[PDB]
Design an enzyme around this catalytic site. Structure first.
Site: not given
Ligand code: 87B
Ligand code: ATP
Ligand code: 87B
Lengths: 350, 349
Positions: B27-31, B34, B49, B164
């Site tokens: 999927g995607s992340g905030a700015y 991932v 990320k 996020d």
């Molecule tokens: O907080 S994050 O921005 N995003 C996030 C974090 C953990 C996650 N674990 C999963 C699994 C895949 C489906 C559930 N997605 C996730 C999404 C983030 C990610 C990496 C470093 C810092 C912050």
């Protein structure tokens, strides 16, 4: 569906706009058209509202308004300025005088991003990708920009870029203001008025722009035509005989012939430390012969943009009918044509 | 300083240490973007990320610094924490990309609703953990602003973390992320009414809580205008106390032009529900941000009587946000960021 208008005074002039537009501030940087910023309550964005000035004062002015509006409506691309709305407060052609353009209130231009910043290669790569993606679209509709410079490029906080203000200056001898810093990005074949010329004039400009972003310095900062062309021939070298024969103008050909020989420099040495792929691309863009210069489509396929390039996400424009050009109408016909475009305007799908 | 290897997913270059194997876009992340990965040193699935274009603008530069300071401070069981933060650059001159690493979660709350039907006792446990995490976040003077099921996630142990945060930038309407997508945002932000306090997060928790108790989403809206109708159908039209609190006079025009609708009793809506659940929702889904219950007060509610332990619902250490007032250049923001990457100490064990 059928909006209600409200009236007010701003620029020492009445502004009659749909009431969806609110908080109109005359944050205006330019004449020949007055612009305000506003809050569009429907979309919930901030917008720029441009009231055209004396749009139909002349045939030339009536024809320019119709040309501008037709183009602005046609251009639907992520990397090209688009029309959110166009409206007139007139309920009839009988009562039709004012035309208003609404667009996104776009951020700072490219100069304001690049003071003397050499800009990282990843950064330049993304910016130039987007200009080219935009040029591919525009060129596909048989349009040539011709004035492409850093001030014509708006950039986001996310480095998303849009091309603004297409060509109003048709052919050299026209509406050319500022004869100092404007000419820095202009292709030689239009500066010197050869016959040899095509859409790749914009590519020359892209070359100049890309170079600036890498170096942090304007590439060909010339004080006038002569100094301009001298700086240019210092880097790319003087025209081969192939190029000299393709030039039709005798004054143009004999002028160039007089210039003393100059070798084409090695760009790797001029752009020291730079990505080899970038230097290679610069070498394909900054070429004198328009037949030999790389096009937008081709540049997009260059290996420099490997990361970004996807031919299915680089659309072309629908065919654009320019037959209204070189037609001889009275000023009323031009006005009525313009009216039709205002009235039949449909916003782009969201 | 370990060995890095290069790779391309999703039209981006990924330059990560060798210890992270088998990257794959999840999927995607905030700015950012991932990728899931396997840490070879600890034998654990990790999320990695890559911050997106961290230093190409002043806004991105500051948002990068803000995000990193935040993740470095957050140390709570119901909040995502850093396992690692690295850059391929070996000097501030060369510093262009930033990577964050955390534990890879099992599933978010969209894929638990899909999965199985939520017994009231499980909802209590999940909502308890969200609030526990909110109390922590709020105790550091942080608002999440964009709390939604995709930003919550669960282990195998049903241990829940908040993912996020929101990027602190007025950026109202215009979205500092993706175009379109609301549903869980409180009205007072959607219409810009007055001074939004931390309870905007609580409004989201209620919407989530309801969607867990009942299969369907609470306010499935089409656009801004629709969303408000949905919200006012349940909540009921504002009162004269609220009309005066709302400083925006433009907003007044809209509210008084709409049809007035009284407040629904929530028993009728949430038929068959636990009365404590209903009762809790009333306090979360009030319209006045003054009387909307807080995370701290919500934990004390009788709905969580099985789970509530005040000696194990901690707050954060003092967080200094004086940087938020400063106006700097990119290389100043970058330099401050570089200092944070270099300083970072991975948590023990
Ligand atoms: O907080 S994050 O921005 N995003 C996030 C974090 C953990 C996650 N674990 C999963 C699994 C895949 C489906 C559930 N997605 C996730 C999404 C983030 C990610 C990496 C470093 C810092 C912050
Ligand atoms: N009679 C006219 N009717 C309509 N448009 C005209 C006419 N004369 C000139 N124009 C338009 O205006 C341009 C010239 O206007 P100009 O900028 O010289 O006027 P001004 O600056 O308002 O006046 P001045 O310079 O005398 O103070 C022409 O190039 C043309 O586009
Ligand atoms: O406003 S712009 O940012 N810059 C500009 C510069 C010169 C212009 N000349 C004219 C004609 C006189 C009325 C139309 N419009 C002009 C506008 C702009 C924005 C979007 C599209 C085009 C232009």
């Amino acid at each position: 569906e059928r909006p209600t208008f409200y009236r007010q005074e701003l620029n020492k002039t009445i502004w009659e706009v749909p009431e969806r537009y609110q908080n109109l501030s005359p944050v205006g940087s330019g004449a020949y058209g007055s612009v305000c910023a506003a809050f569009d309550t429907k979309t919930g964005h901030r917008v720029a509202v441009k009231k055209l000035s004396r749009p139909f004062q002349s045939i030339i002015h009536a024809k320019r308004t119709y040309r501008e509006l037709r183009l602005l409506k046609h251009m639907k691309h992520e990397n090209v300025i688009g029309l959110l709305d166009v409206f007139t407060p007139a309920r009839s052609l009988e009562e039709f005088n004012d035309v208003y353009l609404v667009t996104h209130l776009m951020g700072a231009d490219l100069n304001n991003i690049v003071k003397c910043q050499k800009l990282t290669d990843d950064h330049v790569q993304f910016l130039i990708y987007q200009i080219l993606r935009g040029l591919k679209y525009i060129h596909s509709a048989d349009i040539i920009h011709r004035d492409l410079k850093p001030s014509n490029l708006a950039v986001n906080e996310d480095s998303e870029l849009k091309i603004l203000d297409f060509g109003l200056a048709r052919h050299t001898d026209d509406e050319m203001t500022g004869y100092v810093a404007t000419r820095w990005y202009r292709a030689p074949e239009i500066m010197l008025n050869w016959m040899h010329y095509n859409q790749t004039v914009d590519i020359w400009s892209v070359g100049c722009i890309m170079a600036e972003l890498l170096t942090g310095r304007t590439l060909f900062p010339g004080t006038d035509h002569i100094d301009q062309l001298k700086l240019i021939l210092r880097l790319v070298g003087t025209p081969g005989a192939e190029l000299l024969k393709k030039i039709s103008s005798e004054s143009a050909r004999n002028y160039i012939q007089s210039l003393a020989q100059m070798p084409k420099m090695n760009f790797a040495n001029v752009f020291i430390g730079a990505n080899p792929l970038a230097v290679d691309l610069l070498e394909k863009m900054l070429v004198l012969d328009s037949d030999k210069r790389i096009t937008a489509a081709q540049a997009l396929a260059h290996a420099y943009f490997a990361q970004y390039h996807d031919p299915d996400d680089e659309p072309v424009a629908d065919p654009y009918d320019q037959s209204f050009e070189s037609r001889d109408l009275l000023i009323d016909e031009w006005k009525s044509l313009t009216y039709d475009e205002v009235i039949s305007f449909v916003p782009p799908p969201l």
